């Protein structure tokens with residue numbers, strides 16, 4: 001792209017590299033993703049018409065010389081950087097609530113249009129100075145496993161919208177405690193960290209779990225811990241919501257739409273964050 005003057009590399013995912021760039025003609029600043037099929041582009045072309053206030057806007061899709069570039073509206077900072085910047089004091093609850101609420105709206109929208117994110121993590125949740133937060137880097141049909149739903153880790157071949165609720169629940173907990181909920185460093189360690197905290201799933205809480213591709217009758221049997229210890233600073237409404245976002249059975253896991261009606265959001269507002277850019 002000679003049409004842009006890459007200002008700096010701002011990120012890197014499994015789908016490619018993203019740069020902060022300036023359109024040397026219009027002068028606009030954007031996020032340019034260099035990716036590297038028709039089912040792909042056709043799939044992407046859907047994403048362009050996927051416009052919502054809590055979804056990073058995909059501006060242009062460019063296919064040239066064996067290269068695929070995606071131009072996105074540029075957002076100020078990602079949630080991982082913001083959480084780190086807020087580690088000494090923690091993000092204030094009203095702001096945590098606002099962000100969670102907006103992200104659920106974004107997911108509710110995606111899911112109603114049959115689009116799944118599949119790889120939600122603090123690094124692809126972007127925020128601006130006006131208090132908004134948006135979903136970025138939608139995943140298409142050293143990697144972080146911390147936000148991966150248990151059914152994915154157990155070999156499910158068909159993801160459901162529930163995997164996004166799980167990831168968001170993990171992010172919610174992390175914003176509240178200032179510590180990753182399940183910081184695994186391998187698929188099995190990830191799986192076992194979830195088990196040690198939520199209890200090893202069985203047929204009672206998760207019908208069908210013992211018949212999953214990577215399930216092993218030999219998994220250790222850990223008892224479930226209390227949420228009071230898992231996310232202590234969270235009030236009971238928040239813990240109630242989190243528990244529903246972290247149900248083992250994808251079918252019992254709360255939907256984005258239902259989560260939006262949870263009492264936790266009765267007093268939701270939209271604070272502005274203190275961003276250091």
Ligand SMILES: NC(=O)c1sc(Nc2ccc(S(N)(=O)=O)cc2)nc1N
Pocket residue numbers: 010011018031056072073074075076077078079081082126136137
């Ligand atoms: N991937 C995307 O679509 C992106 S990434 C992005 N900007 C951005 C700005 C600052 C930071 S950081 N690490 O907090 O300084 C991270 C990301 N905007 C879009 N649309």
